[model samples]
Target: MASLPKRIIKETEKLVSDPVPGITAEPHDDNLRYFQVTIEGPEQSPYEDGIFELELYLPDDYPMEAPKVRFLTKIYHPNIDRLGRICLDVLKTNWSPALQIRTVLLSIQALLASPNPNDPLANDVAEDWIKNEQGAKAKAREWTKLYAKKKP
Candidate 1:
């Protein structure tokens, strides 16, 4: 088996044991650096009642480099694309070697709670969020009921 990255192992271990509330994570396979994570929408948010899955893949660089993260579950938010790619600074421009998976997931959850119009991956959604907050919240709730619900 290939050697698992230590920092990856450490960071991932923290999440599995002490997961942030409403979020969970686990490795995809033994001896692999890939992880599958799911985060429940923060309560009182439009995305509440939803479960969003995310993908995390650690490069060989370990702590010196951040893992590549993407949404695996389809979502309809101003900051997230139709393809599930997120457009957030923390994952890109704002990343820090000091940050860890749990912290990043928390940031993603916060991003959903309050989408930014200034920086948007989906322009239409950003416009909707900026122009009509209530309508946008309703639409996001609809997505939760439609796609991210735990059961029909």
Candidate 2:
């Protein structure tokens, strides 16, 4: 394997030493570019009390390109597909070289707090959200309870 960039090393160190509240990211021994991530659902949201697991991989270009992140835990969000692909702008065209792993994860956490159905990644979920927000939120809560439960 190629040597890791200094920026990545620094990011990893900070992630461990000064971890974000409700979020944790750990690099695999064999692959420092890949991370095992978990984000606790924001309070007052449909996903509250749930823990969502995700995988994040830094591309070769790194800061020049956004990290590839996808949810491993099942969630019912309009901007997140069944496959866990997300429709967040920062991960795509809105990406900036200055963005770091921590900021990106924070954006994802914020997404959970405010799902945008207008830019629907899951059409059915988006439609449901648009037509009946209350029902959609209820379904989201149910799915969170069923799939995102934390183990003892």
Candidate 3:
């Protein structure tokens, strides 16, 4: 088995010791590049009370290539698709080497707090959001309650 690179090990260490608020991630012992993650939805949003599950995988060329990430929890948002793919610039063309796992997770949380319907991955949801903002937020809140609420 190939040993993990120093950069990955260092990043993982910092990820545990100095985690971003509202997010928790742990690297798998067998595959250090793979991380199991959870993000608490941002406040003042429809998803605020929910906990979102996600997966983050660092490629061998990480720091040069953006990490592969996707939501495992179902989310009702314009920018997130049924398969949990996200339409965020930072995860795509606009990505920078300077970004880290924490930064990407923070961006996703911010996206939840501010659903931008104009540039959307889920077209129907975007249209609904654009046509009736309140209705869309209500649906998102309802979905969050149904799917993402932390159990008692």
Candidate 4:
């Protein structure tokens, strides 16, 4: 139990020191185990302008188990459910101990870059995305422009 906090501290240090490009992580002042992650959408993707925010909570069984993640921003993605719960296999059943918070967040960033319409959590979205590729991409870009820009 005590080891969890130390592990989280070290992991957070790594993430801050060498953050993934376009991604940022900051831990709660009171609880290092909880982090707020901000990720910029990848280049040349439909989500290019999208800036996503996520929450990560490291459980007492981390390393042996994966950190729990949920998106705070509403994103229209096939793999992401209506509530922002992701359907990535690695997040659920395929997590490995070697996986860290930074790695998981990076994986999510990559998912945004390339959404898999075939294995979507939202069937209708999947169908729409696959049936009309250009239309779907246009809608995504529109939303990114509308919702993801920084408020100044």
**Top TM-score hit:** 2
- What is candidate 2's lDDT per residue for 1-152, written digit by digit as tens? 57899999999999989999889999999999999999999999999979999999999999898999999999999999999988888999889988899988999999999999998899999999999999999999999899996533
TM, every model: 0.90, 0.96, 0.94, 0.91
| Residue 120, model 1, lDDT | 84
The C-alpha local distance difference test score for the whole of candidate 3 amounts to 0.88
All candidates in order of TM-score, best leading: 2, 3, 4, 1
Pairs with steric clashes in candidate 4: none
Better of 2 and 4 by TM-score: 2
Task: Quote model 2's TM-score.
Answer: 0.96
Question: Where does the lowest 10-residue lDDT sum fall in candidate 2?
Answer: 143-152
Residue pairs with backbone atoms closer than 3 Å in model 1 (clashes): none
Q: Listing every candidate in turn, what is its Cα RMSD in Å to the true structure after a full C-alpha superposition?
A: 2.1, 1.3, 1.5, 1.9
Candidate 4: segments with Cα more than 4 A from true spot: 1-4
* Model 3 alpha-carbon miss at residue 95, Å: 1.7
- Model 4 lDDT per residue over 1-152, tens place: 44546777788898989888888898898887889988887889888877878888888888788888888877777787767788777777889977788788889988888889998987777888999978888877887777675522
Question: lDDT, candidate 4, residue 42?
Answer: 83
lDDT of 1 by residue, 1-152 (tens): 46676777777788877879888878776636778888888778887788888888777775667677888877878889988888767777877889888877888889878878778889998899889978988998898888885632
Work out candidate 1's RMSD over C-alphas.
2.1
The lDDT values for all models are 0.81, 0.93, 0.88, 0.81
